[PDB]
Amino acid sequence: KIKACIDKFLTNKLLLFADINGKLYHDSQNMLRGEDMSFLEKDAPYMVGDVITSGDITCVVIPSKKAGGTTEMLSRALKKVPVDEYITTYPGQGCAGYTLEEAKTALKKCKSAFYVLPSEILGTVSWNLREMLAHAEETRKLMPICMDVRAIMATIQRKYKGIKIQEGIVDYGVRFFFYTSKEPVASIITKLNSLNEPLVTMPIGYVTHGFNLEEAARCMRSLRAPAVVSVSSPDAVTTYNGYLTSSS
Amino acid sequence: KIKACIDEVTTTLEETKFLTNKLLLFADINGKLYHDSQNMLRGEDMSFLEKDAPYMVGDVITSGDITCVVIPSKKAGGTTEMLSRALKKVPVDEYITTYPGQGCAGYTLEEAKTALKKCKSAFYVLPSEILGTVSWNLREMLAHAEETRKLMPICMDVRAIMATIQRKYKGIKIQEGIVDYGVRFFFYTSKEPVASIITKLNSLNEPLVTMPIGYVTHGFNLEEAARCMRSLRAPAVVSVSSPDAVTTYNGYLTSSS
């Protein structure tokens, strides 16, 4: 049951979430204040629902929605945590993972009491491919482009003739980043955050991966590398910014 | 909207052909048709589908009466809303189809039913072993495996089981995959997806002696592990805990998803 939502002094015990390997979730990693996280790697790998405790720090291995995990599966792993008062984050965030509404219900269904901590408008433009390519060639920024979009690929081969289209980085006029509709959105986002370069992209997964503007905006939240996100119409700018700011 | 469900009474495939001849098949990103949709085929030319591969989710391909749609994968993160949206990309007509996205970690029968019911198109839906279910413990299963020479899928991340294995089969080098040492073992992790393990076992097509893959180890309860076990095509002896669980597991296996 969600006792309160923060909008730490005073109450003790924290509830952190980790994966099978033992790596903590992004939201739960930020909750740390330089504590000894050696106890978590000492018993790795874990099964879904495994509870690890070291004093006040309590960790639970939760199922991954992007890996097929269900709401019922998450709620069941949360029931394995010993009933107490905890300061936590929302479990399973965020690209292709559990939504804020799904995570809220999971915590509310649990017998334990929770104090839940919460999880750019300027970067949202309305540029077409021609406009974006001009920006990319001058700024020397990386341009994430879906290889499986024939219409876009044609424009690229016509403007940048002699290009050898291959997966990943292709520096030929524009520093392109070619991704497939085969490769998961969370996998592409992980690859771009690792590179930590300035970007000029469209909402990753929109159309190409079966996402509508709302869904692609939720995955874009997990993008940490500075980016210029381009949407179709100028009317879509405010919409995309609405889906980005609001709840999952 | 699901107009009717084929049951042999009082709606047959031959009977429904008067209403429509158009079929709705489902495929993945690569262009490979789903298991349920592959069985619907009667020796038709499926070359048109590989001619424009790879596809994006929601891509509609038509060759006369045969209509194909690339649907999202639930095991790959796909949602109910995403499937319903890809189905809305199909041109509104009367179709003979199967349930989309079956079955290991994919969409349930209840979720697929709603997706078709939400769509503007009318559908004539075709439907998607008790003998293999035993109640043996590890000691019992290992004896069966060493004599029958069958493959034994074992979760590496279960310390209790690993201890028993190293004690009975001393000098064993536990590694991922096939380890033939007394028993032809198949070591899998809780890291590797259930649908990925099942795909690996169907490919090997060997006789098996296993527990319901994913149960406990992957966060599944008996009901959920039974749904994934449906997709196991390689001959297997599925062992459950108690003899009281045998009928339960067989119940979850026979019934709807």
Numbering used by the authors:
A (entry chain D): 389 to 395, 405 to 516, 524 to 652
B (entry chain A): 389 to 516, 524 to 652
What does the report in the manuscript say about this coordinate set?
The most prominent such domain has been identified by bioinformatics as part of non-structural protein 3 (Nsp3) of the virus and appropriately named the “SARS-unique domain” (SUD). SUDcore turns out to consist of two subdomains, SUD-N (Nsp3 residues 389–517) and SUD-M (525–652), each exhibiting the fold of a macrodomain. The two subdomains are connected by a flexible linker (residues 518–524) and a disulfide bond. Instead, we have demonstrated that full-length SUD and SUDcore bind oligodeoxynucleotides and oligoribonucleotides that form G-quadruplexes.
In this communication, we describe the crystal structures at 2.2 Å and 2.8 Å resolution (monoclinic and triclinic form, respectively) of the core of the SARS-unique domain (SUDcore, Nsp3 residues 389–652). Two crystal forms were observed under identical crystallization conditions: Form-1 crystals were monoclinic (space group P21, two SUDcore molecules per asymmetric unit) and diffracted X-rays to 2.2 Å resolution; form-2 crystals were triclinic (space group P1, four SUDcore molecules per asymmetric unit) and diffracted to 2.8 Å. Both structures were determined by molecular replacement. The r.m.s. deviations (on Cα atoms) between the models derived from the two different crystal structures are around 0.7 Å. In both crystal forms, SUDcore displays the same head-to-tail dimer, with the SUD-N subdomain of monomer A interacting with the SUD-M subdomain of monomer B, and vice versa. Due to the two-domain architecture of each monomer, the resulting four lobes give the dimer a quasi-tetrahedral shape. As to be expected, the structures of the monomers are very similar to one another, with r.m.s.d. values (for Cα atoms) of 0.58 Å between monomers A and B of the monoclinic crystal form, and 0.11–0.37 Å between monomers A–D of the triclinic form. In all six independent copies of the SUDcore monomer, residue Val611 adopts forbidden conformational angles. The side chain makes a hydrophobic contact across the subdomain interface and is also contacting the side chain of Phe406 of a symmetry-related SUDcore dimer in the crystal lattice in the monoclinic crystal form (this also applies to two of the four monomers in the triclinic form). One potential binding site for G-quadruplexes might be in a cleft between two consecutive SUDcore dimers as they occur in both the monoclinic and triclinic crystal forms, but for confirmation, any of these models will have to await crystallographic determination of the complex.
